[PDB]
Amino acid sequence: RVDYLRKERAALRIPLSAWVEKEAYRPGEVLAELSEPYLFRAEESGVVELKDLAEGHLIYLRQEEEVVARYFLPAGMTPLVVEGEIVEVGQPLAEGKGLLRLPRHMTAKEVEAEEEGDSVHLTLFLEWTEPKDYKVAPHMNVIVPEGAKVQAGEKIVAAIDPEEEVIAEAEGVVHLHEPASILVVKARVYPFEDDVEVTTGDRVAPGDVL
């Protein structure tokens, strides 16, 4: 198991009398408290992909292969289109019915927004969580500890074969599920930070420096 962190820049718009002004939004923070429903209007064209983030959704607009326009529709704003559709300038995307929160683990930190007389153009730095399971077959070796920070590119499972190798995606904490066996040792453990003066298998007593 490796729980990865995803970060996307995207856009949303709403009526001023519905927004609540802030700098960021916690894994649940109320974004908008809607009195009358809203139909988010498509402001560019292109082929659409949708993203399920548990409660809230994320749309991209693609043209050819390269992406063109990204849109954010929070929890409580259910979508009206599906993956594949071709959609035009002024078409409803989703409906903002009730209370617009941010999913129970998904966040939208440092957001830069601009005012537009009757509406707001918000753009939203979005963190979140999505894990991906990896097999460990007999002739293998996991090469970094569990509950451990990991970066974009550093090896995770070494092997004799390059296709068998495991390179990390992006920022994401590492885990590991169901072992083949459990080793259990009458051993006392001692975390350390820097230099050691003790080799493995050393005969060591109480009051002995490690």
Side-chain angles (χ1 to χ4, degrees), residues 108-156:
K109 276 229 244 174
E110 310 214 271
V111 22
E112 305 254 90
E114 351 174 43
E115 278 142 62
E116 208 188 66
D118 222 291
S119 46
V120 268
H121 174 42
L122 342 145
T123 44
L124 317 123
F125 184 39
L126 303 148
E127 269 197 316
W128 71 93
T129 326
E130 248 166 71
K132 291 268 154 177
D133 262 323
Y134 292 110
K135 201 158 173 112
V136 218
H139 31 65
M140 267 166 92
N141 194 298
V142 185
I143 213 123
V144 127
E146 107 93 11
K149 349 184 192 247
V150 128
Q151 301 328 302
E154 104 159 27
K155 269 202 232 175
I156 286 180

Short mmCIF file of all heavy atoms in Angstrom, two decimals, residues 108-156:
data_model
loop_
_atom_site.label_atom_id
_atom_site.label_comp_id
_atom_site.label_asym_id
_atom_site.label_seq_id
_atom_site.Cartn_x
_atom_site.Cartn_y
_atom_site.Cartn_z
N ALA A 108 -8.11 22.21 -0.09
CA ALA A 108 -7.86 23.22 -1.11
C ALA A 108 -7.12 24.41 -0.51
O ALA A 108 -7.70 25.47 -0.30
CB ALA A 108 -9.15 23.68 -1.75
N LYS A 109 -5.83 24.21 -0.25
CA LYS A 109 -4.98 25.25 0.36
C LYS A 109 -4.82 26.49 -0.53
O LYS A 109 -5.36 26.55 -1.65
CB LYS A 109 -3.61 24.68 0.74
CG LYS A 109 -3.58 23.97 2.10
CD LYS A 109 -2.42 24.46 2.96
CE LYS A 109 -1.43 23.32 3.24
NZ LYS A 109 -0.21 23.81 3.94
N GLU A 110 -4.09 27.48 -0.01
CA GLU A 110 -3.82 28.77 -0.66
C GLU A 110 -4.49 28.98 -2.03
O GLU A 110 -3.93 28.64 -3.08
CB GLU A 110 -2.30 29.04 -0.73
CG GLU A 110 -1.57 28.84 0.60
CD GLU A 110 -0.40 29.79 0.80
OE1 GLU A 110 0.73 29.44 0.40
OE2 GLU A 110 -0.60 30.88 1.38
N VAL A 111 -5.70 29.54 -2.00
CA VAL A 111 -6.49 29.81 -3.21
C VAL A 111 -6.44 31.29 -3.60
O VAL A 111 -6.68 32.17 -2.77
CB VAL A 111 -7.97 29.32 -3.06
CG1 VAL A 111 -8.36 29.20 -1.60
CG2 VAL A 111 -8.96 30.23 -3.80
N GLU A 112 -6.11 31.54 -4.86
CA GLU A 112 -6.11 32.89 -5.41
C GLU A 112 -7.41 33.12 -6.17
O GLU A 112 -7.70 32.41 -7.13
CB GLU A 112 -4.89 33.12 -6.32
CG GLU A 112 -3.53 32.82 -5.67
CD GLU A 112 -2.74 34.07 -5.32
OE1 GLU A 112 -2.90 34.58 -4.19
OE2 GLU A 112 -1.95 34.54 -6.17
N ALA A 113 -8.20 34.09 -5.73
CA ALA A 113 -9.48 34.39 -6.36
C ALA A 113 -9.55 35.84 -6.84
O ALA A 113 -8.91 36.73 -6.27
CB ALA A 113 -10.62 34.10 -5.39
N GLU A 114 -10.32 36.06 -7.90
CA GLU A 114 -10.58 37.42 -8.39
C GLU A 114 -12.08 37.73 -8.40
O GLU A 114 -12.91 36.85 -8.64
CB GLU A 114 -9.96 37.68 -9.77
CG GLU A 114 -9.02 36.58 -10.31
CD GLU A 114 -8.57 36.85 -11.74
OE1 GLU A 114 -8.24 38.02 -12.07
OE2 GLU A 114 -8.54 35.89 -12.54
N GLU A 115 -12.39 39.00 -8.13
CA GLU A 115 -13.77 39.49 -8.11
C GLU A 115 -14.23 39.89 -9.51
O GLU A 115 -13.42 40.32 -10.33
CB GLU A 115 -13.89 40.67 -7.14
CG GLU A 115 -14.05 40.27 -5.68
CD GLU A 115 -13.31 41.18 -4.71
OE1 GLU A 115 -13.64 42.39 -4.67
OE2 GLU A 115 -12.41 40.69 -4.00
N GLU A 116 -15.52 39.74 -9.78
CA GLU A 116 -16.08 39.99 -11.11
C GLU A 116 -17.49 40.61 -11.05
O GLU A 116 -18.41 40.16 -11.75
CB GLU A 116 -16.08 38.70 -11.93
CG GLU A 116 -15.99 38.89 -13.44
CD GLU A 116 -16.18 37.59 -14.21
OE1 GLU A 116 -17.30 37.02 -14.17
OE2 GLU A 116 -15.21 37.12 -14.84
N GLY A 117 -17.64 41.64 -10.22
CA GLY A 117 -18.89 42.37 -10.11
C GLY A 117 -20.02 41.61 -9.44
O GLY A 117 -20.51 42.00 -8.38
N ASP A 118 -20.45 40.52 -10.09
CA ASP A 118 -21.56 39.69 -9.60
C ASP A 118 -21.13 38.27 -9.24
O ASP A 118 -21.92 37.50 -8.68
CB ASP A 118 -22.68 39.65 -10.64
CG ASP A 118 -24.06 39.78 -10.03
OD1 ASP A 118 -24.49 38.84 -9.33
OD2 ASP A 118 -24.78 40.78 -10.19
N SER A 119 -19.89 37.92 -9.54
CA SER A 119 -19.38 36.58 -9.27
C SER A 119 -17.89 36.57 -8.93
O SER A 119 -17.22 37.61 -9.01
CB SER A 119 -19.66 35.65 -10.46
OG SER A 119 -19.32 36.26 -11.69
N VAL A 120 -17.38 35.41 -8.53
CA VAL A 120 -15.97 35.24 -8.19
C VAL A 120 -15.32 34.16 -9.02
O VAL A 120 -15.87 33.08 -9.18
CB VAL A 120 -15.75 34.90 -6.70
CG1 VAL A 120 -15.55 36.17 -5.89
CG2 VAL A 120 -16.89 34.04 -6.15
N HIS A 121 -14.12 34.45 -9.52
CA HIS A 121 -13.33 33.46 -10.22
C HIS A 121 -12.26 32.90 -9.29
O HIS A 121 -11.16 33.45 -9.17
CB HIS A 121 -12.72 34.06 -11.50
CG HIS A 121 -11.77 33.14 -12.20
ND1 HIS A 121 -12.02 31.79 -12.37
CD2 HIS A 121 -10.56 33.37 -12.78
CE1 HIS A 121 -11.01 31.23 -13.01
NE2 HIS A 121 -10.11 32.17 -13.28
N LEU A 122 -12.60 31.80 -8.61
CA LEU A 122 -11.66 31.15 -7.71
C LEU A 122 -10.86 30.09 -8.44
O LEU A 122 -11.39 29.39 -9.31
CB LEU A 122 -12.39 30.50 -6.53
CG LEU A 122 -13.82 30.90 -6.17
CD1 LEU A 122 -14.57 29.68 -5.68
CD2 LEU A 122 -13.84 32.01 -5.12
N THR A 123 -9.57 30.00 -8.11
CA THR A 123 -8.72 28.91 -8.59
C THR A 123 -8.08 28.24 -7.39
O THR A 123 -7.65 28.91 -6.45
CB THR A 123 -7.66 29.42 -9.57
OG1 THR A 123 -7.09 30.63 -9.06
CG2 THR A 123 -8.31 29.86 -10.89
N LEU A 124 -8.01 26.91 -7.42
CA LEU A 124 -7.86 26.15 -6.18
C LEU A 124 -6.78 25.06 -6.12
O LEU A 124 -6.92 23.98 -6.70
CB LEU A 124 -9.23 25.59 -5.78
CG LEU A 124 -10.38 26.61 -5.93
CD1 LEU A 124 -11.47 26.06 -6.84
CD2 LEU A 124 -10.95 27.03 -4.57
N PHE A 125 -5.69 25.38 -5.42
CA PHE A 125 -4.63 24.43 -5.09
C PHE A 125 -5.24 23.30 -4.26
O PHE A 125 -5.64 23.52 -3.11
CB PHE A 125 -3.52 25.14 -4.30
CG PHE A 125 -2.31 24.28 -3.97
CD1 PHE A 125 -1.81 23.34 -4.88
CD2 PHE A 125 -1.65 24.44 -2.75
CE1 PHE A 125 -0.69 22.57 -4.56
CE2 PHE A 125 -0.53 23.67 -2.42
CZ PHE A 125 -0.05 22.73 -3.33
N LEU A 126 -5.32 22.11 -4.84
CA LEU A 126 -6.02 20.98 -4.21
C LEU A 126 -5.10 19.79 -3.87
O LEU A 126 -4.62 19.10 -4.76
CB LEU A 126 -7.19 20.51 -5.09
CG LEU A 126 -8.31 21.48 -5.52
CD1 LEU A 126 -8.85 21.12 -6.90
CD2 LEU A 126 -9.45 21.52 -4.52
N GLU A 127 -4.88 19.57 -2.57
CA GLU A 127 -4.21 18.35 -2.09
C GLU A 127 -5.25 17.24 -1.92
O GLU A 127 -6.44 17.54 -1.80
CB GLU A 127 -3.56 18.61 -0.72
CG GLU A 127 -2.11 19.10 -0.74
CD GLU A 127 -1.42 18.94 0.62
OE1 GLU A 127 -2.04 19.27 1.66
OE2 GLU A 127 -0.26 18.49 0.65
N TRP A 128 -4.82 15.97 -1.94
CA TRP A 128 -5.66 14.84 -1.47
C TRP A 128 -4.97 13.46 -1.39
O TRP A 128 -3.75 13.36 -1.50
CB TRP A 128 -7.01 14.77 -2.21
CG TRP A 128 -6.96 14.33 -3.65
CD1 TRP A 128 -7.10 13.06 -4.12
CD2 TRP A 128 -6.80 15.17 -4.80
NE1 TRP A 128 -7.02 13.05 -5.50
CE2 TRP A 128 -6.84 14.34 -5.94
CE3 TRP A 128 -6.62 16.54 -4.98
CZ2 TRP A 128 -6.70 14.83 -7.24
CZ3 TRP A 128 -6.49 17.03 -6.27
CH2 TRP A 128 -6.53 16.17 -7.38
N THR A 129 -5.77 12.42 -1.16
CA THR A 129 -5.26 11.07 -0.91
C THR A 129 -5.89 10.00 -1.81
O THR A 129 -7.12 9.96 -1.98
CB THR A 129 -5.45 10.68 0.57
OG1 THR A 129 -5.30 11.85 1.40
CG2 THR A 129 -4.32 9.77 1.04
N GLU A 130 -5.04 9.15 -2.37
CA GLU A 130 -5.46 8.02 -3.21
C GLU A 130 -4.35 6.96 -3.28
O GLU A 130 -3.34 7.16 -3.95
CB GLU A 130 -5.81 8.50 -4.62
CG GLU A 130 -7.29 8.39 -4.97
CD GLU A 130 -7.65 9.18 -6.22
OE1 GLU A 130 -7.25 8.76 -7.33
OE2 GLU A 130 -8.33 10.22 -6.09
N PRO A 131 -4.54 5.83 -2.58
CA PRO A 131 -3.52 4.78 -2.50
C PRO A 131 -3.53 3.78 -3.67
O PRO A 131 -4.58 3.54 -4.26
CB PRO A 131 -3.86 4.06 -1.19
CG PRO A 131 -5.34 4.26 -1.01
CD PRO A 131 -5.75 5.48 -1.81
N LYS A 132 -2.36 3.21 -3.99
CA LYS A 132 -2.24 2.18 -5.02
C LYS A 132 -1.45 0.97 -4.53
O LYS A 132 -0.28 1.09 -4.13
CB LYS A 132 -1.60 2.74 -6.30
CG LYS A 132 -2.47 3.73 -7.07
CD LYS A 132 -3.32 3.04 -8.14
CE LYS A 132 -4.59 3.84 -8.44
NZ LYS A 132 -5.40 3.22 -9.53
N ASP A 133 -2.09 -0.20 -4.57
CA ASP A 133 -1.50 -1.45 -4.09
C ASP A 133 -0.46 -2.02 -5.07
O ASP A 133 -0.65 -1.98 -6.28
CB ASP A 133 -2.59 -2.50 -3.85
CG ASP A 133 -3.00 -2.59 -2.39
OD1 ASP A 133 -2.14 -2.46 -1.49
OD2 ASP A 133 -4.19 -2.80 -2.04
N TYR A 134 0.64 -2.54 -4.52
CA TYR A 134 1.71 -3.16 -5.31
C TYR A 134 2.05 -4.57 -4.82
O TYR A 134 2.24 -4.80 -3.62
CB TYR A 134 2.98 -2.29 -5.32
CG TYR A 134 2.84 -0.98 -6.07
CD1 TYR A 134 2.81 0.24 -5.39
CD2 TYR A 134 2.74 -0.96 -7.47
CE1 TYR A 134 2.68 1.44 -6.07
CE2 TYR A 134 2.61 0.24 -8.16
CZ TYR A 134 2.59 1.43 -7.46
OH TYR A 134 2.46 2.62 -8.13
N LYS A 135 2.13 -5.51 -5.76
CA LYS A 135 2.47 -6.90 -5.46
C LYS A 135 3.93 -7.05 -5.01
O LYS A 135 4.79 -6.25 -5.39
CB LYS A 135 2.18 -7.80 -6.67
CG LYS A 135 2.00 -9.28 -6.34
CD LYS A 135 1.21 -10.01 -7.42
CE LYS A 135 1.18 -11.51 -7.17
NZ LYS A 135 -0.18 -12.00 -6.80
N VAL A 136 4.17 -8.05 -4.17
CA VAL A 136 5.53 -8.48 -3.82
C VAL A 136 5.64 -10.00 -3.97
O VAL A 136 5.34 -10.76 -3.04
CB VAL A 136 5.96 -8.02 -2.39
CG1 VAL A 136 7.43 -7.61 -2.40
CG2 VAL A 136 5.10 -6.87 -1.90
N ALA A 137 6.04 -10.43 -5.16
CA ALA A 137 6.20 -11.85 -5.49
C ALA A 137 7.55 -12.38 -4.99
O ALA A 137 8.50 -11.61 -4.88
CB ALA A 137 6.05 -12.05 -7.00
N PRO A 138 7.63 -13.69 -4.72
CA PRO A 138 8.83 -14.31 -4.15
C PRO A 138 10.17 -13.59 -4.39
O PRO A 138 10.68 -12.98 -3.44
CB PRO A 138 8.83 -15.70 -4.80
CG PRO A 138 7.36 -15.99 -5.08
CD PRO A 138 6.57 -14.69 -4.93
N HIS A 139 10.71 -13.64 -5.60
CA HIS A 139 12.01 -13.03 -5.90
C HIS A 139 11.93 -11.50 -6.00
O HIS A 139 11.99 -10.92 -7.09
CB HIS A 139 12.67 -13.64 -7.15
CG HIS A 139 11.70 -14.14 -8.18
ND1 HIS A 139 10.85 -13.30 -8.88
CD2 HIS A 139 11.45 -15.38 -8.65
CE1 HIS A 139 10.12 -14.01 -9.72
NE2 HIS A 139 10.47 -15.28 -9.60
N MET A 140 11.79 -10.86 -4.84
CA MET A 140 11.67 -9.40 -4.73
C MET A 140 12.23 -8.88 -3.41
O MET A 140 12.65 -9.67 -2.55
CB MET A 140 10.21 -8.97 -4.90
CG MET A 140 9.82 -8.61 -6.33
SD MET A 140 8.04 -8.50 -6.57
CE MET A 140 7.75 -6.76 -6.24
N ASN A 141 12.23 -7.55 -3.25
CA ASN A 141 12.80 -6.87 -2.08
C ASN A 141 12.33 -5.41 -1.99
O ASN A 141 12.73 -4.58 -2.80
CB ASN A 141 14.33 -6.92 -2.12
CG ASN A 141 14.97 -6.53 -0.80
OD1 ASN A 141 14.81 -5.41 -0.32
ND2 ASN A 141 15.72 -7.46 -0.21
N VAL A 142 11.49 -5.12 -1.00
CA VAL A 142 11.06 -3.75 -0.72
C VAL A 142 12.22 -2.97 -0.12
O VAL A 142 12.86 -3.45 0.83
CB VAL A 142 9.84 -3.70 0.23
CG1 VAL A 142 9.33 -2.26 0.40
CG2 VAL A 142 8.73 -4.62 -0.26
N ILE A 143 12.49 -1.77 -0.65
CA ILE A 143 13.74 -1.07 -0.34
C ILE A 143 13.63 0.24 0.48
O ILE A 143 14.61 0.99 0.60
CB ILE A 143 14.60 -0.91 -1.65
CG1 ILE A 143 16.10 -0.97 -1.33
CG2 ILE A 143 14.24 0.35 -2.43
CD1 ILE A 143 16.86 -2.06 -2.09
N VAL A 144 12.45 0.49 1.06
CA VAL A 144 12.23 1.63 1.96
C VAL A 144 11.14 1.30 3.00
O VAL A 144 10.19 0.57 2.68
CB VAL A 144 11.96 2.98 1.17
CG1 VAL A 144 10.66 3.68 1.60
CG2 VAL A 144 13.15 3.92 1.29
N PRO A 145 11.28 1.80 4.24
CA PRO A 145 10.41 1.40 5.36
C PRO A 145 8.95 1.85 5.25
O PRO A 145 8.63 2.71 4.43
CB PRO A 145 11.07 2.07 6.57
CG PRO A 145 11.76 3.25 6.01
CD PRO A 145 12.28 2.80 4.68
N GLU A 146 8.09 1.25 6.07
CA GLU A 146 6.67 1.60 6.12
C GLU A 146 6.46 2.81 7.02
O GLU A 146 7.24 3.04 7.95
CB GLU A 146 5.83 0.38 6.56
CG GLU A 146 5.26 0.44 7.97
CD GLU A 146 3.86 1.02 8.01
OE1 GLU A 146 3.25 1.19 6.93
OE2 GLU A 146 3.37 1.31 9.12
N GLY A 147 5.41 3.57 6.74
CA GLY A 147 5.14 4.82 7.43
C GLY A 147 6.23 5.84 7.16
O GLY A 147 6.58 6.64 8.03
N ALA A 148 6.75 5.81 5.93
CA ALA A 148 7.91 6.61 5.56
C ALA A 148 7.65 7.50 4.34
O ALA A 148 7.05 7.06 3.35
CB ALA A 148 9.11 5.72 5.31
N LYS A 149 8.12 8.74 4.44
CA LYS A 149 8.04 9.73 3.37
C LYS A 149 8.74 9.24 2.11
O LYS A 149 9.75 8.54 2.18
CB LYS A 149 8.66 11.07 3.82
CG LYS A 149 8.97 11.15 5.31
CD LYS A 149 9.49 12.52 5.70
CE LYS A 149 10.06 12.51 7.11
NZ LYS A 149 9.25 13.34 8.05
N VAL A 150 8.19 9.60 0.95
CA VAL A 150 8.76 9.18 -0.32
C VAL A 150 8.59 10.27 -1.39
O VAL A 150 7.59 10.99 -1.40
CB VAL A 150 8.21 7.80 -0.76
CG1 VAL A 150 7.65 7.81 -2.19
CG2 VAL A 150 9.29 6.73 -0.59
N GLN A 151 9.58 10.38 -2.28
CA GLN A 151 9.61 11.45 -3.29
C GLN A 151 9.33 10.96 -4.72
O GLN A 151 9.03 9.77 -4.94
CB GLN A 151 10.93 12.23 -3.23
CG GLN A 151 11.24 12.91 -1.89
CD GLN A 151 10.00 13.39 -1.14
OE1 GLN A 151 9.22 14.18 -1.66
NE2 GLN A 151 9.83 12.90 0.08
N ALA A 152 9.42 11.87 -5.69
CA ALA A 152 9.09 11.59 -7.09
C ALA A 152 10.27 11.04 -7.89
O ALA A 152 11.05 11.80 -8.48
CB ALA A 152 8.50 12.84 -7.76
N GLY A 153 10.40 9.71 -7.91
CA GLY A 153 11.42 9.05 -8.71
C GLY A 153 12.28 8.02 -8.00
O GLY A 153 12.84 7.14 -8.64
N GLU A 154 12.38 8.13 -6.67
CA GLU A 154 13.26 7.24 -5.90
C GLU A 154 12.72 5.81 -5.82
O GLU A 154 11.52 5.60 -5.60
CB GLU A 154 13.56 7.84 -4.51
CG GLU A 154 12.81 7.23 -3.32
CD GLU A 154 13.49 7.50 -1.98
OE1 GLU A 154 14.20 8.53 -1.85
OE2 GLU A 154 13.32 6.68 -1.05
N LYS A 155 13.62 4.84 -6.01
CA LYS A 155 13.28 3.41 -6.06
C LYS A 155 12.48 2.94 -4.85
O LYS A 155 12.66 3.44 -3.74
CB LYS A 155 14.56 2.57 -6.17
CG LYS A 155 15.01 2.26 -7.59
CD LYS A 155 15.91 1.03 -7.62
CE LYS A 155 17.22 1.30 -8.34
NZ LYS A 155 18.14 0.13 -8.25
N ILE A 156 11.58 1.98 -5.07
CA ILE A 156 10.79 1.44 -3.97
C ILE A 156 10.90 -0.10 -3.85
O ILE A 156 11.01 -0.63 -2.73
CB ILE A 156 9.31 1.96 -4.02
CG1 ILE A 156 9.26 3.42 -3.56
CG2 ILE A 156 8.37 1.06 -3.18
CD1 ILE A 156 7.86 4.07 -3.57
#
